[PDB]
């Protein structure tokens, strides 16, 4: 604990980012990664300030959603840690890396801006921002899990793990990874 | 080692069991029939609940002194669904708080203080602080 900061249980180091681009905006570490995904964390005050927020805190925050869960954070911390446990048992390896790898294969690489185009709407394909790419990746996949975990006997944590695993693996099975592939195809149709 | 030194959830687990084993409380007639506060849909799922809330009430009296029954209804207050209207605070049941504090009166866990209201007695401080010492020495966990 004094030399290195664990994430409750798991490790910060030995979490190798693949895509030089998602790197720098994925804060699984600068060196700076904390015990919890909670922190007063006034990152909203400025534009890219957002990036320095550690990705797991962001993932919790993106989980605090659909009105009934708005403001409910400790509720969501518990969900994440249980998913990380579930990812640990299911796959193995650090769940942080499984999250990082999930993030990495989930955000689009190009999208399709709605330009006006006379009046009736036809797009142009444009090529996405690394921060935006991470952001969409985070929300897509958190959202994917939520909508899985409604009306079946399956915990959010359990669903959230299974999406994160079916994301890290390019499964075309995760909501997130599938919705992304369809997004990129739409952009190709107007590239 | 005192009670503040212990995880309060597992303390009242033992205190209630201490209050069962002793077997001289005076759980009243109702128990089965009674609701517990106008809040509630249902009766308590623990059918031996009077032991538990007598325990929880005592441990409160250890921490905060001079607590009347009106104080006790406030501590066991909560949300009240009007159902289709917005919720509000309802205070706990009077009689069951009263029946508890009379039960600790007879046990001599407590004594009604100068300037009104109940406060716990040494012979009660025995039991409360003794059982903390028991819990603390359960295991290193």
């Amino acid at each position: 604990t004094p030399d290195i900061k664990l994430f409750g249980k798991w490790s910060t180091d030995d979490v190798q980012i693949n895509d030089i681009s998602l790197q720098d905006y994925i804060a699984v570490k600068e060196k700076y990664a904390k015990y919890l995904p909670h922190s007063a964390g006034r990152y909203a005050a400025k534009r890219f300030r957002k990036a320095q927020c550690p990705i797991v805190e962001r993932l919790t925050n993106s989980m605090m959603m659909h009105g009934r869960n708005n403001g409910k954070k400790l509720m969501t911390v518990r969900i994440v840690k249980h998913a990380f446990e579930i990812i640990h048992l299911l796959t193995g390896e650090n769940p942080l890396q499984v999250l990082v790898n999930a993030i990495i294969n989930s955000g689009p690489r190009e999208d399709s801006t709605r330009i006006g185009r006379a009046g009736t709407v036809r797009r142009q394909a444009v090529d996405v921002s690394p921060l935006r790419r991470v952001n969409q990746a985070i929300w897509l996949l958190c959202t994917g899990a939520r909508e899985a975990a409604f009306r079946n006997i399956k915990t959010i944590a359990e669903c959230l793990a299974d999406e994160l695993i079916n994301a890290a693996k390019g499964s075309s099975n995760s909501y997130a990874i599938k919705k992304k592939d369809e997004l990129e195809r739409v952009a190709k149709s107007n590239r | 080692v005192t009670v503040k030194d212990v995880n309060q959830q597992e303390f009242v687990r033992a205190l209630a069991a201490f209050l069962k084993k002793s077997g001289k409380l005076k759980v009243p007639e109702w128990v089965d029939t009674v609701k517990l506060a106008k809040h509630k849909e249902l009766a308590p799922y623990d059918e031996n609940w009077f032991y538990t809330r007598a325990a929880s009430t005592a441990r409160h009296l250890y921490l905060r002194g001079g607590a009347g029954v009106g104080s006790m209804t406030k501590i066991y207050g909560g949300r009240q669904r009007n159902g289709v209207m917005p919720s509000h605070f309802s205070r706990g049941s009077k009689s069951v708080a009263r029946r508890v504090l009379q039960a600790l009166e007879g046990l001599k866990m407590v004594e009604k203080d100068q300037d009104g209201g109940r406060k716990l007695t040494p012979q009660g401080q025995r039991d409360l602080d003794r059982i903390a010492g028991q819990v603390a020495a359960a295991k290193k966990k």
Partner: protein, 61 residues
Amino acid sequence: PIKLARVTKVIGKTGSQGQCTQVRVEFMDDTSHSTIRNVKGPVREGDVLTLLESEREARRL
């Protein structure tokens, strides 16, 4: 060929509603090359795009 490319100079936000930043990008494998092209999101000097195509090069939109 998913070529990476580093943003050298963010020019100005094009787009109908205002969104697509026009960005000039050094081309990583050989930095002599330099396309101008558009980006959805918050962009800044010193980050790396992920161009799929490598030969389109937008201008006004």
